[PDB]
């Protein structure tokens, strides 16, 4: 909580927010990211699978706020029918698609159109590794719209047995709520790391600060491994920036 107490973090966020209003170039910038300088190499190769960081105090977003794309295993009939009929998930997803249909209908410029229309992409964990070839490069550089791994039903796989195919609408909704409210991060085999902590015009500066403390606590807490506790050896420095703005330091060892 020492970072929250320091006035520097408060000062940096005030300057950053002020510029976005002043500067025409930063007008389309809406998200606030923190750049963390871990002391030593994380040693985790980028697997492009987001890891959820729980933000206890405040929620970044709600499922109803965003366009959500669900990519399901072939055939998508069982999942599309079950999710659409259920009252909890009848109106949760903008579109439900299968991998094979997704590859066929969207190619080239259509993939670019798909990128803009949807704010959040989620996919069955079974088909997550296929998406990089399908969705293309645009989805998979920058970390803004990486698909999230979700599980359709609570059934588990056992060796030498066949998993029963089911769709649990309440479980799917619960996972999506966690994804939206909580922030996320992707490990990489280098010092730098980027995490979204706030949204301009929606979170007050005290709220954005609290999200940073939750992010730092989770990433440094060894008890939260493997999802957390990835920053071993402390943090050399932390900055704050938008997509196109410059980095404002908020902590330095």
């Amino acid at each position: 909580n020492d970072i929250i107490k320091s006035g520097l973090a408060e000062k940096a966020l005030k300057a950053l927010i002020l510029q976005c209003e002043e500067n025409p170039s930063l007008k389309n910038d809406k998200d606030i990211h923190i750049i963390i300088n871990t002391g030593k190499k994380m040693g985790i190769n980028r697997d492009n699978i987001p890891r959820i960081i729980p933000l206890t105090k405040y929620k970044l977003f709600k499922p109803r706020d965003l366009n959500i794309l669900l990519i399901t295993k072939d055939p998508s009939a069982l999942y599309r029918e079950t999710l659409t009929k259920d009252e909890h998930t009848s109106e949760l997803f903008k579109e439900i698609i299968s991998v094979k249909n997704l590859r066929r209908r969207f190619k080239g410029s259509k993939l670019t159109q798909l990128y803009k229309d949807f704010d959040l992409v989620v996919a069955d964990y079974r088909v997550h590794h296929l998406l990089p070839e399908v969705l293309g490069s645009r989805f998979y550089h920058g970390s803004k719209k990486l698909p999230y791994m979700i599980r359709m039903s609570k059934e588990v796989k056992l060796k030498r047995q066949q998993m029963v195919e089911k769709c649990d609408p309440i479980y799917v909704r619960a996972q999506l709520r966690s994804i939206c409210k909580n922030t996320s991060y992707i490990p990489n085999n280098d010092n730098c790391l980027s995490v979204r902590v706030g949204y301009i015009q929606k979170h007050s500066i005290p709220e954005i600060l609290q999200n940073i403390q939750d992010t730092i606590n989770f990433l440094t807490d060894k008890s939260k491994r493997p999802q957390g506790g990835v920053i071993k050896g402390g943090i050399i420095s932390i900055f704050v920036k938008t997509s196109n703005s410059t980095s404002l330091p908020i902590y330095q060892f």
Binding site: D47, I49, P50, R51, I52, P54, H88, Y125, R126, H128, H129, Y148, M149, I150, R151, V156, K157, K159, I170, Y171, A174, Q175, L176, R177, S178, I179, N182, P226, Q227
Partner: peptide, 24 residues
């Protein structure tokens, strides 16, 4: 929860809590 076919599942699975399940 672990799936031998997909090791990537166990990391990066959305945590689910009681507040998430209860209807708004």
């Amino acid at each position: 929860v672990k799936d031998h076919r997909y090791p990537g599942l166990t990391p990066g699975l959305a945590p689910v809590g009681l507040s998430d399940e209860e209807d708004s």
